[PDB]
Amino acid sequence: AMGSMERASLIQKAKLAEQAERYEDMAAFMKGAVEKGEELSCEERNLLSVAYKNVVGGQRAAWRVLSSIEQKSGPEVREYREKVETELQGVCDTVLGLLDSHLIKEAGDAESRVFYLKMKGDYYRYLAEVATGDKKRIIDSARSAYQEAMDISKKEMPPTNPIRLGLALNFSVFHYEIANSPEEAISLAKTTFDEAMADLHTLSEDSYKDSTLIMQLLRDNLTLWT
Template structure:
């Protein structure tokens, strides 16, 4: 297994992310009944995210070109190209979801690990939804909501400043804002997470604080933006 972990790191450095994910799939399959280490979990996060980053970026670029009036005569060509990219994105997101569902979640014994994996599945359904339409959009949005809620339930006993719990609040709030178009619910989730972290900040150890504070800043930025859009710019979150 150590050799495959090493090769996953080599694939990461080489920007060969499909290979990286294949190495990681072998690692989680071969871990027996035990969950993988935090280091391997972090590799999973990096490998999976990079696997789809090119497609997410490409789809947004083509969409911007398609919407440019200068290129109106090529809109149908851009639409076809977007669909091709969207299909590739969906395929890779499903690959991630299948790996986590089949080989990671069944081995997760601790709440922290369960939150990490359930949030990850919610994330990849959300990424699929970014480019989906029609019934597929409805399906993946519902699945994202389901897994984010399961992660939220699993996180209830974690410390308010736990980085996985905060990261879940960040991404679940973005889900409500971007896919559900419900800024009030997004603000509610973000504000609850921030208030919990603020009340317990003195209990943080150095490593916890480093991981938590970067997520807290993102939550604050989003919350300020969303409240300003709602016309509530005066109701700002206090600095931590």
Template sequence: MNRISREDIIHRAKLSEKAERYLDMTQAMKAVSETGIDLSNDERNLFSISYKHAVGKKRSAWRVMTSIEQTFEGDAMWKYERAQIYREKIQSEIEELCNEVIHTIDNHLYPVAQSEESRVFYSKMKADYFRYQAEVVGDPERRRKIVSSADRLYKAAMETAESVMNASHPIRLGLMLNYSVFLYEVKAATRRAINTAKEAFDGALEEFETGILTTEAYKDSTIILQLLKDNVKMWSTTDGRPIDLLPES
């Protein structure tokens, strides 16, 4: 892919985002990712945003259909079976997209990443998509392996992040946010989730007064700090759904 065609594909990805055609956006960014060239920060964020929205819509649909399926239990069998079939179809689509992200990172993005920051970003993203799979997979053995993969990737990414990034760095903060959500939602480890989120919040807050962050990073980190704070409050008082990292961050 030459420079002109690369720019054209990225432009198409941006147009797809404006039109909210996220599956088109994923395919454009997948093509850019397969060129063997390390993505810029902006390209990396476009890649992340495209799949976050595409999978996010299907995750929401899966939750709705799961709820509907449960309401049909004990009702007319055909209604229950129709809901089950449709829920399984959505599940298959989620798993397909998640596997596409994981494959692209493993085979095209991580091998050419030039910085530890990019490697942390991709490891976190890969862990996130294992987490999304864990949300929908019913088979206990498959789910156990998926959860184990996510946990290992989150921990490896955190170890690297702690050695190369300040506690207030938005990528490190986002990693801690999403790992805490993983602990709460997938592993049902509420106390560990709260402690992880609090530790990330407190560590970043101590650095904020030093002025080490750029204006853009400060903005991103502030948003994530609020999400951490909101989740800790919610986990401590209710059974509400936690908020994970906004794709724009």
């Protein structure tokens, strides 16, 4: 639907939609920008991620409320949970489709390729949260994406790089919540935290603030898990 709008206007409107907390609009603007076929800048990648994370985050929260009601239990609660589930799956498939056509294959720099592979892992993870039918193949798809991202990140990025940190955080969550691997989750969070800590001395004040924020999330998880 956004084929007639200029790329720059789509990006401008995504920023306006963010300010207005209109995340569905923001996602549609960024989908349109991606479909222009040009690579995305760092800022643009972040706009894409914020938009879809907010959309799917609302869906996931609703799904969890409905699934809890359904667990406690006519066909209505199941029907509605299924409706929300299908809508969530659709959003995940849309994101995965953008990554596959053709953001990942055009991403050569480590910052972009890791970013997109992390996103791929995240959206398969969300699919895994609701899967019951090929749960295993979905889980393996998430794992593979996260693993490729981690292999690049460890080769190409310092241990304090925020995308490297956020990837490791989310892969640890994948292990704990999806793969039933809490020890792997804790290991990963601890090693990531400690290697980042040892590299903080290299950073500026601003970079330090960025890295330590994400480190605190790793710590929050380790506190919950141990």
